[PDB]
Amino acid sequence: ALVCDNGSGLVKAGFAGDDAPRAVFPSIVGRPRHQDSYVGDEAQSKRGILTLKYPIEHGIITNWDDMEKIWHHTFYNELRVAPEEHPTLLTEAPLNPKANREKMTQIMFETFNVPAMYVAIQAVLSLYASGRTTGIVLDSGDGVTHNVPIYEGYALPHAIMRLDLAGRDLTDYLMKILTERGYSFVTTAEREIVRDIKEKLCYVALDFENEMATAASSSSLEKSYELPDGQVITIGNERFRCPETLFQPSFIGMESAGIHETTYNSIMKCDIDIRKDLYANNVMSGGTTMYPGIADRMQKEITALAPSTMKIKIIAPPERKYSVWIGGSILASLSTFQQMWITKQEYDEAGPSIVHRKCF
Ligand SMILES: CC1=C(O)[C@@](O)([C@@H]2C[C@H]3OC(=O)[C@H](C)[C@@H]4CCC[C@@]5(CC[C@H](O5)[C@H](O)[C@@]5(C)CC(=O)[C@H](O5)[C@H]5C[C@]6(C)CC[C@](O5)(O6)[C@H]5CC[C@](C)(C[C@@H](C)/C=C(C)/C=C/[C@H]3O2)O5)O4)OCC1
Ligand SMILES: Nc1ncnc2c1ncn2[C@@H]1O[C@H](COP(=O)(O)OP(=O)(O)OP(=O)(O)O)[C@@H](O)[C@H]1O
Ligand SMILES: [Ca+2]
Ligand SMILES: [Ca+2]
Ligand SMILES: [Ca+2]
Ligand SMILES: [Ca+2]
Incomplete structure (x- = not known):
């Protein structure tokens, strides 16, 4: 087959x-x-x-x-x-x-x-790839993001959540904010460069404000990126401002809830008796979940929304571009x-x- x-x-x-x-x-x-x-x-x-x-x-x-x-x-x-x-x-x-x-x-x-x-x-296939038949998947690719809670092999259709926000939007936003820093990315080749920067250097901050303060007062979070032609540009707070959009879509003018909020709301649409299993089996899927730090940030945000006694576990398989x-x-x-x-x-x-x- x-x-x-x-x-x-x-x-x-x-x-x-x-x-x-x-x-x-x-x-x-x-x-x-x-x-x-x-x-x-x-x-x-x-x-x-x-x-x-x-x-x-x-x-x-x-x-x-x-x-x-x-x-x-x-x-x-x-x-x-x-x-x-x-x-x-x-x-x-x-x-x-x-x-x-x-x-x-x-x-x-x-x-x-x-x-x-x-x-x-x-998303269901991704859950299977992690060795599970019960859990809630966050699947985020180039074009769309979904939350899909799954029990004994089958999605719970009424609890599925969709966000328009995904990787191409993030590449576009990185291009915007690098342009604002004073760089220029107007050719197709230059766009491909931005996508590479996103994939190689971006990460999710545990706390946005604290990370912005670090970036403001030190060069500790800065990375040099060499373009194919030899130009070198410094990527600083853009590294984490780009994927912060997943948690705060307002950065790109979207009024939608962020991925932590959609995960929570999806779980809350499910039978109360399966929520414990969903919270303990949050599986990330797709290339837009590849950002370093995303699991720790999701852990923090879901913990803030969920009952105090709830066990929260975020699973981020290494192979999740292909799950x-x-x-x-x-x-x-x-x-x-x-x-x-x-x-x-x-x-x-x-x-x-x-x-x-x-x-x-
Ligand atoms: C077996 C099988 C199906 O269940 C199905 O063939 C289902 C049956 C259909 O359900 C349907 O006709 C309904 C969609 C389905 C029926 C059961 C209840 C349900 C499940 C989802 C939920 O209510 C509701 O739409 C929610 C809460 C989900 C959500 O994030 C928001 O609204 C938002 C935000 C936005 C950013 C704005 C609106 C949208 O939802 O995204 C979604 C809602 C749908 C669409 C317009 C996207 C288009 C491309 C898809 C449609 C219209 C799909 C419809 C169907 O897919 O975008 O809707 O999916 C594939 C596999
Ligand atoms: N290390 C990385 N960090 C950030 N983003 C990444 C990384 N690797 C891949 N991506 C992004 O993941 C996206 C592609 O992932 P994937 O193959 O899951 O999407 P898709 O299946 O084509 O799209 P969709 O599922 O939205 O229809 C692209 O936006 C790409 O730039
Ligand atoms: Ca996909
Ligand atoms: Ca052309
Ligand atoms: Ca907002
Ligand atoms: Ca607790």
Whole structure:
């Protein structure tokens, strides 16, 4: 079986039973000026002269014709398989419109002619990858963030929380605040530099004000960053001002609650008798949870919101850029799961609506 985890920013793809995805590449289709399209790494290589479309926006497929290009590029170019020969497990956002679930299903069976398929919620797979079937996942990628409380293997759908804020917003904000410091980032290459700075040097402060005071009065938190061309810039408080936005979205003009508040509110929407287990099993997933210090800050903030006697545990797996995929690999490899696939026969009989009955 194949496991394909389609994100807003990155596709992660591979073979069920493997440790790790074999392919990880940008979820883009690029087009040159009129007077021809490029997908994935090919498009990234030529970004300066292409216009890019991201077929997934905030975790939701929005450009179906380019999504098919991504899927075809995944099967043919990246995995070197004919999808007609392999059951395929795909992933979806924790909140995904009904019409989109049916369309994905229709495309896989009618266009790619898969023998079987399944679609799983991304956060749930991440929980499985941490060795759990109960817990609350915070999954934050390039395009969207969700909180998903999960009990005995299944998400509690009414308690799911969504935040628009994710990694691309953070890159944009780092670019803004570095521009304010006096630097310039106006080309596509310069934007890529900002994303690298974010990934290499940003961290979450335990307390914003205290950290700002340290940065104000000392060079102790400053890091030199060398650009590819040899310019050197000093990144100081921008290191932690950037991801502080996750806890205080007002930094980018969003009125939304922060990720600690959404986690708490999600837990509070669950049966009182499962909350202890959720608080003790807060699992972080996705690239935007990779910031150093994020677990300690979440611990602090959840402790401030939760009952005084509650045990709070935040789990941040080292491999969490890839946990959704890894969970898919686990699930697709389970003998007891093989009854759960939608088969071509089932599709032929029931049509796209079959996904409602088989995938939850
Ligand atoms: C089996 C399966 C499903 O349950 C499902 O196919 C469900 C069934 C649908 O439920 C649905 O039709 C409802 C969404 C679902 C039904 C059960 C109750 C519930 C679950 C979530 C919750 O109420 C409510 O929306 C909350 C509290 C969640 C939340 O963070 C805020 O409102 C906010 C903030 C904002 C920043 C602004 C609004 C939004 O929620 O985000 C979310 C709400 C949905 C959307 C507009 C995003 C679009 C892309 C997704 C939609 C409309 C998805 C709808 C469905 O997904 O953005 O809504 O997801 C995939 C897997
Ligand atoms: N070490 C790091 N520190 C901060 N951010 C990181 C780090 N590594 C990766 N990222 C960010 O994580 C994001 C990509 O993560 P991921 O692959 O989980 O997202 P996705 O699945 O493409 O998006 P989404 O889940 O929102 O649809 C990017 O914004 C990227 O810059
Ligand atoms: Ca993702
Ligand atoms: Ca250009
Ligand atoms: Ca606020
Ligand atoms: Ca306590």
